[PDB]
Design an enzyme around this catalytic site. Structure first.
Site, PDB file in Angstrom:
ATOM      1  N   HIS A  78      24.793  63.248  12.411  1.00  0.00           N
ATOM      2  CA  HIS A  78      24.054  62.291  13.224  1.00  0.00           C
ATOM      3  C   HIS A  78      24.852  61.771  14.412  1.00  0.00           C
ATOM      4  O   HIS A  78      24.276  61.095  15.271  1.00  0.00           O
ATOM      5  CB  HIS A  78      23.597  61.114  12.361  1.00  0.00           C
ATOM      6  CG  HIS A  78      24.511  60.817  11.214  1.00  0.00           C
ATOM      7  ND1 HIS A  78      24.319  61.341   9.954  1.00  0.00           N
ATOM      8  CD2 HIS A  78      25.625  60.052  11.137  1.00  0.00           C
ATOM      9  CE1 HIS A  78      25.275  60.914   9.151  1.00  0.00           C
ATOM     10  NE2 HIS A  78      26.080  60.128   9.843  1.00  0.00           N
ATOM     11  N   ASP A  99      26.224  67.947   4.941  1.00  0.00           N
ATOM     12  CA  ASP A  99      27.243  67.670   5.962  1.00  0.00           C
ATOM     13  C   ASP A  99      28.440  68.620   5.834  1.00  0.00           C
ATOM     14  O   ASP A  99      29.562  68.230   5.503  1.00  0.00           O
ATOM     15  CB  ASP A  99      27.694  66.203   5.927  1.00  0.00           C
ATOM     16  CG  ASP A  99      28.385  65.786   7.199  1.00  0.00           C
ATOM     17  OD1 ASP A  99      28.026  66.337   8.258  1.00  0.00           O
ATOM     18  OD2 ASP A  99      29.284  64.920   7.146  1.00  0.00           O
ATOM     19  N   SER A 104      30.891  56.188  10.927  1.00  0.00           N
ATOM     20  CA  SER A 104      30.450  57.158   9.940  1.00  0.00           C
ATOM     21  C   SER A 104      31.613  58.023   9.473  1.00  0.00           C
ATOM     22  O   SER A 104      32.631  58.164  10.152  1.00  0.00           O
ATOM     23  CB  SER A 104      29.371  58.063  10.526  1.00  0.00           C
ATOM     24  OG  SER A 104      29.894  58.809  11.609  1.00  0.00           O
TER      25      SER A 104
END
Lengths: 151, 151
Positions: free
Chosen positions: B28, B50, B102
Site C-alpha cells: 500500500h 506481502d 507501515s
C-alpha cells in the site's frame, strides 16, 4: 468488575454481565437496560440458555476474560460468598440468593468468568444453584439440580 | 535492528524490514528506498501476503533471524511499546497507530522477528494491528481485524 444491571420499575431485576464475544442478559428476568451506549444493542431472543446477542463494539469488548473448560475442583469466589466444587455447585451459606439478583458471574482466582448463574434461590441447608457452565470441550451446557427454582 | 525508511518527496510514508532470505516492503506504500545497495532490488507485486523479492547478496545477509511457530503469548518487543498475546495482537494503548509507519517488525526477547504490521490506524478506545503470522509449521498467514484501514 463492571457488569451493568437491569432496572425494572426503579428496583433491580437482574444483572446483565458483559463478556467478550457475547454480552449476556437472561430473558428469564425482565426490565430495560440503562446504558445508553448499550441501548442500541439489538435484543435477539435465543434458546433456553437465556442468551442475548453480542453486538458489542470491539474496543470495549473482551474486557472480561472467560475461563475455558476442564475447570478444577478448586476455590472460586461468589460475589457474596464462596463455592468449592467442580461437577455441581458447593454448599453456600443461606440468606443469599433471594429474588431479582441473578446473572452475576462466578469468577476464579485469575478473575476469568467461569459460569453465569440463573437460579438457586433456596434448596435446604446446603444450597446448590442452577447455573450454566462449560462441560468438557467448550460445550456450553446448562445444569439445574432437582427441585430448582428460578432466581 | 536494521529497518529502512521509504522516501516519497522527502517524507516518510513507510518502513521496509529485512529478514534473512528475503526483504519486505508493504504494497500500500510507495517511494524510493534509502540505500544504494537496495536500489537494484527487483520490485514486484504480490497478493495480500506481502511478498517482495529479496535479491540482496551475501554482503548484508543474516540480519534478523526468523522466529518459528509455537509462539508463547508472552512479552514481545514492539518498537513503540510492547505486545503480549499470540492468537491476535494485544490491545496497544492510544496515541500509537498514526500513519506512514507501515511494515515495522515486532521483535522478540532474543531479537527475532515474528510479525510485520500492515494496518489499523484506529479502532476506538483500543487499537488492533493486522500482522502476518506463521500458524503451526511455518505457513505464513495474513490476519486482519474487522474494518482495519491500511496504515
Amino acid at each position: 468488575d463492571k457488569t451493568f444491571p437491569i432496572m425494572l420499575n426503579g428496583q433491580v431485576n437482574g444483572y446483565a454481565c458483559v463478556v467478550g464475544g457475547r454480552v449476556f442478559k437472561p430473558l428469564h428476568v425482565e426490565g430495560r437496560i440503562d446504558n445508553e451506549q448499550l441501548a442500541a444493542i439489538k435484543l435477539k431472543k435465543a434458546s433456553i440458555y437465556d442468551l442475548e446477542y453480542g453486538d458489542v463494539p470491539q474496543c470495549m469488548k473482551s474486557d472480561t476474560l472467560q475461563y475455558t473448560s476442564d475447570k478444577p475442583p478448586g476455590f472460586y469466589n461468589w460475589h457474596h460468598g464462596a463455592v468449592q466444587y467442580e461437577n455441581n455447585r458447593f454448599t453456600v451459606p443461606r440468606g443469599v440468593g433471594g429474588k431479582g439478583d441473578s446473572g452475576r458471574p462466578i469468577l476464579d482466582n485469575k478473575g476469568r468468568v467461569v459460569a453465569i448463574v440463573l437460579g438457586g434461590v433456596n434448596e435446604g441447608s446446603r444450597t446448590a444453584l442452577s447455573v450454566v457452565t462449560w462441560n468438557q470441550k467448550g460445550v456450553t451446557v446448562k445444569d439445574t439440580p432437582e427441585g430448582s427454582e428460578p432466581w
